[PDB]
Amino acid sequence: ILPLIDLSTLYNLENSAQAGLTPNVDFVVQYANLYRYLSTIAVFDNGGSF
Amino acid sequence: MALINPQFPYAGPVPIPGPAPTETMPLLNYRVEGRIAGIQQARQFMPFLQGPHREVAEQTYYAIGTGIQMGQTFNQPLINTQEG
User: Fold this and answer.
1) Where does chain B show beta strands of DSSP type E?
2) Portion 1-50 of A in contact with B at CB < 8 A
3) Which of A19, A13, A25 is nearest to A44 (CA)?
């Protein structure tokens, strides 16, 4: 006896790296299509300085 | 709808010099036969596609199977000898 939709859904933890930031304007990172996002973590790597 | 002056009436128009009567008559302009030139191509390499598009994307699926289901070693209960 199995939950069929539960064992066919994936709970994923991908990560990425976006570039192309310029000062004093918006830098938008698009959420992808057809995912159910639960949390977002952004690390601002500012050229080896945090 | 002017009112006739009875003290100072006037008559109809008198002849005046004229504008050389043939020079007010035009020629009838004489069209020759014409042709949309060239042999036309049958199709054109269009910059846009001619079909419909979709506004939203829908998630598609495909069925998969599980595997050969095995037996198990259950932890088995105690005997109901009036303690349970």
Assistant:
1) none
2) 2, 8, 33-34
3) A19
